[PDB]
């Protein structure tokens, strides 16, 4: 599921490429952490939070790249 990709971005951000970073919907990712499924201990929730912010961070950096190359091309 999507919590799995979040789990990967928390601990092993290497095996995570642009394709997951762009495909990922943070709003639904976050929503599946907030709302049930199998209820999580606080420790796992903290990992998933760091994973969500990790992807948010990558999404922001990728947008920074496609900008600093489209403002240098036009």
């Amino acid at each position: 599921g999507p919590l799995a990709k979040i789990w990967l971005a928390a601990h092993w951000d290497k095996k995570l490429t642009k394709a997951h970073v762009f495909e990922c919907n943070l709003e639904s990712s976050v929503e599946s952490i907030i709302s049930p499924k199998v209820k999580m201990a606080l420790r796992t929730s903290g990992h998933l939070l760091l994973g969500v912010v990790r992807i948010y961070h990558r999404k922001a950096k990728y947008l920074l790249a496609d900008c600093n190359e489209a403002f240098i091309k036009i």
């Binding site: 789990w7 990967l8 928390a10 601990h11 092993w12 095996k15 943070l26 709003e27 990712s29 976050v30 929503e31 952490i33 907030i34 201990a41 606080l42 420790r43 796992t44 929730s45 903290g46 990992h47 939070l49 760091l50 969500v52 912010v53 990790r54 948010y56 961070h57 999404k59 922001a60 950096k61 947008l63 920074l64 496609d66 900008c67 600093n68 489209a70 403002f71 036009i74």
Partner: protein, 381 residues
């Protein structure tokens, strides 16, 4: 994820290369005399995996190096080969090899024959659900009877750590700082948007719009996590308590046990005689009874944060035959969902076991060899 194979060399009594026959995914039991090499095997696994061995000063490193007459050793390594059928390890291999090499001036991990930091290793292990937090994957008799005799204050400290509040706080501080690191990049794209091939503008502004909704969702997430951080200790208490009572009733059929708060500490009240308001405080139980109850609590906590394998070094030492059989029956049940590697001197755990290993100390070194159920039972009696 389970331990498929262990290779040891130069490590305490395992002076010479020691290639242990592949383990069962269920319950492996190891037998041998005092001084044969059983705890040394478990220390070899902990040397690779346990957070507490991750940093060592020279004085502790050389205590790991084999010492004795004959060939002097200068380096040691332990290698664990993980079976990765369930794909819990974020590496696309059926088998994952993790090796730690120790010398007086060297200390290096090799993940699948390639160098990795200590941080790589502990991140890898948490990826697969094997925390540097919950340190109950490995249990020792000294851990059990230390828990048998611990005060109520110790048990509350224990409960805090399984609640996870400390690491949650570290992840949040990590998250927030990384949030600040994006607010500067978000500023150098939103301010940078002034300039703007007409379609790519709308497609990029779509993605700016996406970072704006995600910022809001992240802020929402941080609120719900900060509110449950203050419910964690009470919620895990509730969870471990229920687990503890169910475990004890499986161990001691008509018995009853509960945890009680006080927040100052966590007490235990127990009745072996059968829910008859015969609730004794932990400290007034017998020696064996404290050790069974300590074990039930460990089993309850392992249930709050399960691991793919368990190492038990002499857990039934203080236990009589009735309570040993109960521990064995429980282990047989748990061993269908998790790997077990145990050592014992009594026959009850042997009934629970799918593979048997014998440890011998001969010619100044330890040896570990596959044996039969008959030989294990014969040794034990």
């Amino acid at each position: 994820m389970y331990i498929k194979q262990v290779i040891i060399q130069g490590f305490r009594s395992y002076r010479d290369q020691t290639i242990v026959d592949p383990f069962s995914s269920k319950h492996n039991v190891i037998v041998g005399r005092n001084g044969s090499g059983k705890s040394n095997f478990f220390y070899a696994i902990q040397f690779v995996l346990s957070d507490e061995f991750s940093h060592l000063r020279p004085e502790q490193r050389l205590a790991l190096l084999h010492e004795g007459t004959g060939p002097r050793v200068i380096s040691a390594f332990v290698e664990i080969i993980f079976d990765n059928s369930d794909n819990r390890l974020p590496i696309d291999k059926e088998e994952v090899s993790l090796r730690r090499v120790i010398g007086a001036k060297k200390d290096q991990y090799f993940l699948d024959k390639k160098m990795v930091t200590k941080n790589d290793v502990m991140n890898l292990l948490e990826s697969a659900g094997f925390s540097r937090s919950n340190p109950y994957y490995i249990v020792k008799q000294g851990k059990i009877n230390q828990m048998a005799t611990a005060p109520d204050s110790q048990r509350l400290k224990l409960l805090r750590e399984v609640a996870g509040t400390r690491v949650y706080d570290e992840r949040k501080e990590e998250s927030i700082s990384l949030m600040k690191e994006t607010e500067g990049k978000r500023e150098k794209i939103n301010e940078l948007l002034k300039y703007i091939f007409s379609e790519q503008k709308e497609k990029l502004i779509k993605r700016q719009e996406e970072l704006d909704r995600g910022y809001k969702s992240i802020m929402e997430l941080m609120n719900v996590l900060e509110l449950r951080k203050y419910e964690a200790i009470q919620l895990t208490f509730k969870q471990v308590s229920k687990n503890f009572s169910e475990v004890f009733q499986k161990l001691v059929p008509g018995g009853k046990a509960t945890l009680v708060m006080k927040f100052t500490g966590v007490g235990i009240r127990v009745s072996f005689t059968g829910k008859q308001g015969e609730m004794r405080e932990m400290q007034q139980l017998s020696g064996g009874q404290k050790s069974l109850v300590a074990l039930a609590l460990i089993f309850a906590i392992q249930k709050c944060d399960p691991a793919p394998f368990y190492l038990f070094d002499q857990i039934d030492q203080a236990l009589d035959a009735q309570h040993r059989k109960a521990v064995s029956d429980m282990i047989m049940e748990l061993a269908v969902h998790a790997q077990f590697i145990t050592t014992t001197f009594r026959p009850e755990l042997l009934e629970s076991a799918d593979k048997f290993y014998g440890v011998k100390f001969r010619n100044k070194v330890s040896h570990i060899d596959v044996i039969t159920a008959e030989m294990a039972k014969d040794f034990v009696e």
